[PDB]
Design a protein around this ligand. Structure first.
Ligand SMILES: *[C@@H]1O[C@H](CO)[C@@H](O[C@@H]2O[C@H](CO)[C@@H](O)[C@H](O)[C@H]2NC(C)=O)[C@H](O)[C@H]1NC(C)=O
Ligand SMILES: *[C@@H]1O[C@H](CO)[C@@H](O[C@@H]2O[C@H](CO)[C@@H](O)[C@H](O)[C@H]2NC(C)=O)[C@H](O)[C@H]1NC(C)=O
Ligand SMILES: *[C@@H]1O[C@H](CO)[C@@H](O[C@@H]2O[C@H](CO)[C@@H](O)[C@H](O)[C@H]2NC(C)=O)[C@H](O)[C@H]1NC(C)=O
Ligand SMILES: O=C(O)[C@@H]1Cc2c([nH]c3ccccc23)CN1
Ligand SMILES: O=C(O)[C@@H]1Cc2c([nH]c3ccccc23)CN1
Ligand SMILES: *[C@@H]1O[C@H](CO)[C@@H](O)[C@H](O)[C@H]1NC(C)=O
Ligand SMILES: *[C@@H]1O[C@H](CO)[C@@H](O)[C@H](O)[C@H]1NC(C)=O
Ligand SMILES: *[C@@H]1O[C@H](CO)[C@@H](O)[C@H](O)[C@H]1NC(C)=O
Ligand SMILES: *[C@@H]1O[C@H](CO)[C@@H](O)[C@H](O)[C@H]1NC(C)=O
Ligand SMILES: [Ca+2]
Ligand SMILES: [Ca+2]
Ligand SMILES: [Ca+2]
Ligand SMILES: [Ca+2]
Lengths: 51, 490, 145, 102
């Protein structure tokens, strides 16, 4: 789950936006969902990438 | 007290505090010998014009019998040199009899003081004067900190407070749709509160401030270089400078040396009309600057009185000699023949387009005079004192003048009502000007491109004509001062 | 010694300081019973110390304060004769920022006194928090009045 | 004849001497500047041509000069000196407000 921006409110206040399929977020307080590499997809929880 | 003064004897003495010099000699006392008096440098012709405005107003009151008949206003006017120490020497001269009476014969009793220009200088002067409840009506001290009557009991001003000006800067930034600006302020009681108010307003209006740097006229080359580095590293084209001319001159000179261009300067009223910044050879840096100016006033007969100056003819103005010696580069260095024409040398003394702080000094003097008139023309049982008792104009005291100034309501020569609210403040509009290069000459023309209506409600106070703004002095395209480009559809 | 009470007020402190500088004042403004104060210990408040420092450095009378810690009193251009036995408040704002960073907070509020003490310190803390990625929800100014 | 210790006020009910030590240091710093004026060798002075002030007719600016060049020792054996801005850098102690069990 990545960090989404709340308009008009500073950076410390963010929403939790679930990563889409194909991308993933492994760490906490992540500002971007990273795409799994070639020949790799994302598991159900979007916490890692499986072949 | 201090010398070089301008003094006229009268039944009632009005003190004056004007910056006839832009500053003092930067010579740090090593204390190996007894510290002598510091010298004042950088002669200010605009401050001399302000002093002449005070003298002209006092002479007008002394000539017109409709105001204060058979009562003469005198003056003791000193030079502060924008320095707290000089103005404090002058203030100690003002409170000599008062401090003798309070602590411990021919010394004049200052009934009220007109000044000073700097908010820190006026703060020190108010600290000293409020001990004796001597009214002090400033003409150019617009700091919000001076609206605290618990600390400044006897302070008044004929200039608007600078919260509206910071709100106006934020409104201007919102109008042109910028969110990525940098802030610069003088490290004094004027720049700091105003830039803080601007920061609150910008946070309210969702404007990100990249850098906030403090400046001073005594800043070392290291500090100035650091501020210039901060400006260069930043991508914020718009820089909000809430400072004065002398405090911004080192930074502007250093930036001109390194040719930083494309920066949009939002000027506070202190330096938006400054001859120390609005120089023809700085236009590739400070060109297109958008600044604020106060209401322009009219003083009929003021220009003739300004042109009637003469070192020998004017015996009550000890500043006239140095004015002559710096105007014509003469000594009374070639000798001062005394027949030189004021309309021959281009100085801010005469080459003025509007009277804004001069009108403020005029209003200060007339506010004091109308308070004295209310003291004089008062029915016995309707005075502003105990049991409706009245002050005696023959033996008037400073605190009585303060009391009548708090409840003051008089009319200008422009037909505008002048009163001071519970905070001892005056409310006034603003005119938004843009620094244009002159086609005919090389001077920096201050072109009026909008206004700010303090009486209007929020969001309707600002009015700007973008067609009249030349960005950076040459460009008609509103610059881009956002941190990131707009995210498009999808 | 000649010691007066300031009552945390600029007015009382300036009356006392006018007592302090009486001989220098009459010398520079034109009875030997008036004593010559060679130096002043005080004061507590930073605004009080600012006014007293203006008046005293006018006559170059040293003033060694014990509680006034405003950074504005470190300006020797304005305050030539001011000295401190208390640390400046440049470090205390940084220390508060380090405390907030240590406990892993980023959403804080700020209150300051509306005087030469609270305002510079809270500005320095705002700068340090901005450096340390701390978001300040509100900034309020208070006073005893 | 009332006993000062009978009534609990911040006058005696104190645990540490923090600002009181600051007042003590201010007084002793001025005293040590005056001593440096007094213990001044004729050719070794802070004034013009290495001249020294007269302790019997000393002036405030001379004491200011000596205070700016003052480097003495506490009663705790720690050096006190003032920087170019007349500041005395020192540590801080982080304290926590608790409630007295008794
Ligand atoms: C710079 O950023 C500001 C801040 O968002 C932009 O202002 C927005 O402009 C659009 C259309 O003009 C409005 O719908 C928004 O309400 C504005 N947001 C505000 C005022 O907070 C501005 O357009 C940007 N300028 C650019 C990218 O050139
Ligand atoms: C401050 O500015 C406003 C707007 O420039 C002034 O209001 C105008 O007043 C004139 C007459 O004096 C009217 O003809 C205009 O229609 C007004 N414009 C408005 C209301 O937007 C206002 O008078 C100025 N303040 C003072 C004290 O004169
Ligand atoms: C509160 O917010 C701060 C934001 O700084 C969090 O601190 C970060 O925590 C992440 C988690 O591993 C680290 O990667 C960052 O380096 C930390 N930044 C710092 C310490 O500046 C903190 O964890 C948050 N706490 C809670 C309870 O939400
Ligand atoms: O409060 C202050 O410090 C500024 C000083 C100032 C103003 N306008 C000026 C024009 C020339 C010189 C100085 C000034 C506005 N009030
Ligand atoms: O600068 C100032 O105003 C504060 C006042 C102050 C400090 N520490 C204190 C302890 C007790 C009473 C007052 C104080 C720190 N300097
Ligand atoms: C600007 O960036 C350069 C890059 O190294 C840096 O050296 C300089 O200190 C910066 N200026 C500042 C931080 O004011
Ligand atoms: C500064 O840059 C401008 C163009 O941005 C140029 O016209 C001007 O000659 C430059 N001046 C100096 C002194 O480098
Ligand atoms: C000032 O007096 C005029 C009358 O000339 C009145 O209309 C106005 O309301 C008064 N203003 C204040 C603030 O008392
Ligand atoms: C003060 O004197 C001591 C020697 O007694 C010396 O070690 C120290 O460096 C001196 N400090 C300063 C700031 O001169
Ligand atoms: Ca918001
Ligand atoms: Ca001044
Ligand atoms: Ca100027
Ligand atoms: Ca005090």
């Amino acid at each position: 789950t990545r960090k989404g921006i709340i308009e008009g409110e500073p950076t410390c206040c963010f929403e939790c936006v679930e990563c889409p399929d194909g991308e993933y977020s492994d760490e906490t307080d992540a500002s971007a969902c990273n795409k799994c590499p070639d020949d790799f997809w994302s598991n159900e929880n979007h916490t890692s990438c499986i072949a | 007290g201090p010398d070089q003064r301008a003094q006229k004897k009268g039944d009632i003495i009005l003190g004056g505090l004007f910056p006839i010099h832009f500053g003092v000699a930067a010579k740090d006392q090593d204390l190996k010998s007894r510290p002598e008096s510091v010298e004042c440098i950088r002669y200010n012709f605009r401050g001399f014009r302000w002093l002449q405005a005070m003298i002209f107003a006092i002479e007008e009151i002394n000539s017109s019998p409709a105001l204060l008949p058979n009562l003469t206003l005198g003056y003791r006017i000193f030079d502060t040199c924008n320095t707290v120490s000089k103005a404090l020497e002058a203030t100690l001269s003002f409170v000599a009899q008062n401090k003798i009476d309070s602590l411990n014969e021919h010394i004049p009793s200052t009934i009220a003081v007109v000044g000073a220009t700097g908010s820190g200088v006026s703060t020190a002067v108010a600290n000293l004067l409020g001990l004796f409840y001597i009214p002090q009506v400033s003409y150019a001290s617009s700091s919000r900190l001076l609206s605290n009557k618990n600390q400044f009991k006897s302070f008044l001003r004929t200039i608007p407070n600078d919260e509206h000006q910071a709100t106006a800067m934020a409104d201007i930034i919102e109008y042109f749709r910028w969110n990525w600006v940098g802030t610069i302020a003088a490290d004094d009681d004027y720049g700091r509160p105003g830039i803080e108010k601007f920061r609150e307003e910008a946070e309210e209006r969702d404007i990100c401030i990249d850098f906030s740097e403090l400046i001073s006229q005594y800043s070392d080359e290291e500090e100035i270089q650091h501020v210039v580095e901060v400006i260069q590293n930043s991508t914020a084209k718009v820089i909000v400078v809430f400072s004065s001319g002398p405090d911004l001159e080192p930074l502007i000179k250093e930036i001109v040396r390194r040719n930083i261009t494309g920066k949009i300067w939002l000027a506070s009223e202190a330096w938006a009309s400054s001859s120390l910044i609005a120089m023809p050879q700085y236009f590739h840096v400070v060109g297109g600057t958008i600044g604020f100016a106060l209401k322009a006033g009219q003083i009929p007969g003021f220009r003739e009185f300004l042109k009637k100056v003469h070192p020998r003819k004017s015996v009550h103005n000890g500043f006239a000699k140095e004015f002559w010696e710096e105007t014509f580069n003469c000594h009374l260095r070639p000798l001062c023949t005394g027949d030189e024409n004021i309309s021959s040398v281009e100085t801010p003394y005469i080459d003025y387009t509007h009277l804004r702080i001069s009108y403020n000094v005029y209003l200060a003097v007339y506010s004091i005079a109308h308070a004295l008139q209310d003291i004089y023309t008062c029915l016995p049982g309707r005075g502003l004192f105990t049991n409706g008792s009245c002050a005696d104009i023959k033996k008037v005291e400073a605190w009585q003048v303060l009391k009548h100034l708090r409840h003051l309501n008089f009319t200008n020569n422009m037909g505008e009502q002048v009163t001071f609210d519970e905070c001892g403040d005056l409310v006034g509009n603003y005119s938004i000007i843009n620094w244009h290069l002159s086609p005919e000459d090389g001077s920096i023309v201050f072109k009026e491109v909008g206004y700010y209506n303090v009486y209007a409600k929020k969001g309707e106070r600002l009015f700007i004509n973008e067609e009249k703004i030349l960005w950076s002095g040459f460009s008609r395209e509103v610059p881009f001062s956002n941190c990131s480009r707009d995210c498009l559809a999808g | 010694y000649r010691i007066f009470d300031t009552c945390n007020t600029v007015s009382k402190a300036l009356e006392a300081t006018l007592s302090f500088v009486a001989q220098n004042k009459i010398d520079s403004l034109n009875s030997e019973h008036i004593p010559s104060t060679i130096a002043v210990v005080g004061a507590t408040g930073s605004g009080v110390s600012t006014a007293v420092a203006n008046l005293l450095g006018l006559f170059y009378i040293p003033q060694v304060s014990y509680a006034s810690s405003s950074r504005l009193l470190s300006n020797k251009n304005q305050f030539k004769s001011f000295l401190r036995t208390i640390p400046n408040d440049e470090h205390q704002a940084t220390a508060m920022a380090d405390i907030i960073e240590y406990f892993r907070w980023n959403w804080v509020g700020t209150i300051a006194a509306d005087d030469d003490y609270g305002r510079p310190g809270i500005e320095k803390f705002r700068e340090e928090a901005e450096e340390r990625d701390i978001c300040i929800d509100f900034s309020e100014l208070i006073s005893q009045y």
